[PDB]
Symmetry: D3
């Protein structure tokens, strides 16, 4: 909840940000969105990997051929505007491009244009306030993630989340904090809404995009940070049993940030606490907003 939402170029009051119930996206899942985070840092409010997220928004729209009238820079300026206009120092930003009030035909008529929305509001830890220090208990779901050439997993589209809803709800229904999904082959894909990382003998390990894992921006940042710390990273297909033999396992995402997993299916993950490597990575990631970790890549975009 906040005061204004950027809607097609205009700052509209949150309560007046309405759309017709016959909007295409409500019926067909025809929307593309992002998850960006604004952090209060040593140099004021800063949007983490702002450009990268807006570029992915365009990429997701490009795969579905959704016409986007706004350039990446326009969207970035609009994003900063929303944060300032609402007087937020830290928040969760949510850009959403959707097919609006067009016909009821699955295929939108030629010459149509999409509606764009950017909402920002403060949001806590996605998996619990105590999830970052003490781990979470995860469960391997009975539902598998989308097959390779069906519904593109590289795109962050609305319709994709019926799957995340099934995987995540099954875990919570049985008392776990999050569910881990396997692909159609029986290999580890990722969590319901976050990438998965293991740690064996001091080595990282993450499933490639071909395991139906979305190319997370946080995932990418962790791989680059790991290389700075001198930790070997391996991007390979992982079996289900590896979760039980791993020394450490954690999840990554914009909302989830870096959450350690202390157990999988009731089987404790070495010690049952946040591990050594996960700790180093957490410190290095959060150190970006304290100044301790030098921003060598230009990941911090000042809101002003």
């Amino acid at each position: 909840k906040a005061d204004y939402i950027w809607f097609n170029g205009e700052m509209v009051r949150w309560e007046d940000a309405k759309v017709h119930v016959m909007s295409h996206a409500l019926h067909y899942g025809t929307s593309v969105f992002e998850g960006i985070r604004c952090y209060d840092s040593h140099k004021g409010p800063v949007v983490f990997r702002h450009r990268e997220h807006m570029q992915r928004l365009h990429d997701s729209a490009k795969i579905y051929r959704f016409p986007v009238s706004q350039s990446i820079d326009e969207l970035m300026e609009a994003c900063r505007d929303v944060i300032r206009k609402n007087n937020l120092t830290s928040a969760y930003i949510r850009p959403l491009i959707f097919v609006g009030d067009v016909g009821m035909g699955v295929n939108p008529p030629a010459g149509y244009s999409t509606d764009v929305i950017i909402a920002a509001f403060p949001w806590g830890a996605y998996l619990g306030a105590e999830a970052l220090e003490q781990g979470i208990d995860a469960m391997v779901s009975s539902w598998n993630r989308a097959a390779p050439n069906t519904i593109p997993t590289a795109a962050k589209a609305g319709g994709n989340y019926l799957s995340s809803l099934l995987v995540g709800s099954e875990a919570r229904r049985h008392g776990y904090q999050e569910g881990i999904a396997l692909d159609v082959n029986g290999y580890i894909s990722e969590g319901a809404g976050e990438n998965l990382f293991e740690v064996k003998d001091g080595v990282l390990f993450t499933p490639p995009f071909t395991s139906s894992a979305l190319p997370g921006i946080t995932r990418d940042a962790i791989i680059k940070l790991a290389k700075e710390l001198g930790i070997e990273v391996r991007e390979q297909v992982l079996s289900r049993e590896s979760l039980y033999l791993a020394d450490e396992v954690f999840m990554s995402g914009t909302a989830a940030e870096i959450t350690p997993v202390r157990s999988v299916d009731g089987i404790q993950v070495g010690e049952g606490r946040c591990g050594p490597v996960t700790k180093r990575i957490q410190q290095a990631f959060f150190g970006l907003f304290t100044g301790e970790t030098e921003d060598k890549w230009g990941w911090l975009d000042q809101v002003n």
Copy 2:
């Protein structure tokens, strides 16, 4: 376009049927819908297999665990009310159950309730004016339909249509009227938004639900009508080549009704016109609204 839309129990004017842009379904494809048709018949306006569609709406919501406060009878009465209220004699009804303005978390908070909408409006033939008499040209898409244990194909949910959008747009981009999708195994599934039927040596043939084909109500009706006409029906897995060797091939759906396919991938389907068996079935189906075909199953529900 029409006058009123049934919205959570109230007949609201079309222009005022708005919902918040932060509605869950807009971001995560969390909606379930139906496609129903009202025909002007020999006994006045009648809704084809009304109860069956309403029962499927409940079944689709049940799989996803979406709470539905309205009973099947309540929805049916509401449906007839929409048609009468708008003075429609024939139309396309569109029931939609969606997760509204709840949090931004993938899993809605316990105790939430869904919003329901029922909109009716006149709609012509889905594949074209001439489509029913002269066939359509179809193309086998390069995109496959959802794998078995990923996103349930038996449910008619919003998020499912990202796939239908990809299959159908590819066909139309290349000059065809509709696209035919194969499942992940390489067998025939169905069209982008309609079931597929073949006709070999006087025998029907349709893919089973396990070929990722949705349990169509029109599909079911055709199978029952064929049995009355003494036509042998076979529900079996079909290979791609079968489309080139079939004497006849047609598609079924609420919007598409019964549309013959005159060619697949530029390869003509026996004669290039509507076939004999397809013709008999079309006459038997439309005969229900003329009185020529006796409604032995009670598929015609009077609007009054």
Copy 3:
């Protein structure tokens, strides 16, 4: 627990029925077994489908090429002997053919012979004393059953049960009575140790053997009984969603007999009680031992 166990042709006291710890089967799962039931009936103690079970024992041994010195008749006579010698009127018989104390090489040396054991003892309802009247709550497991050309599912071999152990324990760990496994394709296979049956519009439905479902003797009996009752039976591949849309669903097995399933994954199966068709079948099956159902197939083998 009982007094004697038939061991290689001799009635040995239960406590002296020992075998060396270096027996091949203990290390490599190299054993084949059966589950037979003795019922107290209107014509005294009777072994249900005795010959069929012994024939399957030979078939399972034949697939693995295990040498069996005893003929089907010898094993049947030995079986009756064990029941009489222990003064049992009703019991669970357990024939077991295993590779004994041979070398430690995976492949037994040429000219080796197997050890045979037949133990009988009273055993109650496998899924609970109240499981037959009121249903059980089942869960779809995250573990899949064996792929088609890996470890033959038609054979009832020891090593097969590591899978049943994984599927069944996961269900019980989460509060369910039994787990239902899908095959590698994402289709319904069967329960951890029992075949699965659904009931839609008055029609049965069971997965074929090709869905990695073991050719159960109880399953076969139910299909033949159903045909006598005039119920249509369909042996076809079933999707996971079908469990949620079914009017009735039950499990079959020698130990489980005919157990109705009142819910799958927390989703109630029409009414939440034993259904109409399942009831008819239960009455018809148990009626065999009361005389109400005529044994037209010769399924009851008198112990004497």
Copy 4:
């Protein structure tokens, strides 16, 4: 054959190491085991990678949730005791953890404990006397290895060997020394009871664990030794054809050690004798027991 066998903490005479015929593991393949080797070296009898094998025994039991009361150190001391007690200088040790005399239900009753055994005895080369110097003839089996999410291949459990029995017997029935299995996808997995290695243009090559290949300890040792010799190692999925195009191909295992493969399916592997790289690795491996190869990893555990 030897004098004593460690049985649940006691050194029992070989002849008296018996267990009941109703032991769970005999009927359901519920056991986990290891293969360890004691070599007579330049520093006396030494167990190769002792702790590593004991840790894997615990990992295999962990996946199946089998309760193990003994710690890794306890098992190691017990192992050395068995070797000393039997006056062995070189032998094959066989640790076995199995579900004993509990009920006949697939799932053991809560609070049960497992029986543990450790037997040692001298064993020659698994594939033959000449096998190490002259290669062996291998055949690609018609039976595939277990699919990814069915029965965990990372675990060395009893029931797993029904597959190894099928693959290996087929090869020997046709005149070959060992069989090579493909996974369900058609890629190379491993031999019936040993890992597979190829050698192309001076580069190693081995299938990853995700190809249903067990994480062999010998496999791991070879990878580490190769890196010391400056040989490039590549863990990647290999097609069947690669076996015909490889310059060298060999198998690894505790029992098989390092055995070269001179031909696959009657097609000679470059020269038909042990290759250059295989030779270097064999000399480096056996050099550990001569002192020529320095034990930089601490793989040699003294028995005393």
Copy 5:
């Protein structure tokens, strides 16, 4: 070997029927062919299911879009011509449509035409002279048949036989008469060059076309003959183990006719001789050329 070959409408002497070495089909497998048999019967030389085979030739060419200038009737007349011209009373006819001397590009240039050839010559029992009375020993091959949507198995094209070459040679290399191939899923497909049939409890059984089994003309005839004899036929997916449990198993094809299989993988198929049902079908099939079996379908086409 014979005197004349029909080549593009001309009766050319066998020795002069040559084609350039740069013919497309020689480098790219771009050919489509048939196998037809002429039998000496009670009504003189007759071509078994002549029209059906010519219709399939056109169908195979249609799938690949090879232009065929000759009508089905022209090809049939040409076939009878070849038989007469060579004074044959019984023979094996071989129609072949191939892409000739066009460019070396994979895709032939627009406006090209195909070359057609029809050769007839006497040919004995495909699987051996004694194969029809005493069975043959078959082996399950380690090579799988083509996946569903790759190279159409419904078409009888030249390039398809690289697979048949691999499956068949592997069997013969090991002492068997024919090889049985499985599909990519691990189910029974068919023999290297003939359809596979099983016989369980008096019931037939054959894999559907979707198991990568070619729609054989002999296969079709046998299904129609069996229905006349009152034998139940089931077209379903078959597991590998079913070959070991079947009472009878035989293969069908134009060249192989109806050949019983007495063993599969060294495992005897009930009695090890031609079974009862196979015998009835053989007598019914060959009875067509003696007059004993009435030709109700018009399968015998007179050569004159």
Copy 6:
């Protein structure tokens, strides 16, 4: 077209290089071939990677067990002979080993020998004259490439091209210059007759052989050239969406050389012209024939 063709050791005139119409390869696709190029360079006519191509010819024949009487050196000398005899300075060489006039049985009789042919002739740009400078528009085909253990993709055999014919003709039928095929899993395999390369953030990327991609000689050369230019190369499985997100994409082959792809499915590949990295690689490749790029590997074989 040229004057002479090397045929079984003899220089035969082009017009007289004929083979019988009953040649095995014409009916069963039993042939193996290569594609080699001769370039006019700074040191005169030179055959690019001559030995490598002849070695692959032998490898392809070895897989199918086709007897080859000529050694690699004999074939190389014969190749140079053909070029000289025809007075060619630049040409496309085509070695072809095929099963000739043997029986009509799928498996050739023991003791048979193959026929060998080497034809050379000038051939232009495979994908078009302008294709090397301006890119080509490609389409993702609806036909998939051969599954892993069916018809070996590592071999360049005649029968393989029925697949290439289907993939390539579909693209050209819709207005594209070439078709890109996916494997049975839905991952990128390669073009109809050329390997596929992507370029993301300055990094290469190519599918491994296990994605049913033929081990191209040009592909290998490009990987080695890129390593010289200091460009990172990654051999990994690629998803379909990656084609839309790539900065650059190009195809490689002997006939196609190095062809940039400016669009895939109507979606422009960054700028729509030949990219920076592709350009550097093209210049480095063609520089080998100008002397600008030093031949460190000995890829240029002088014709003399």
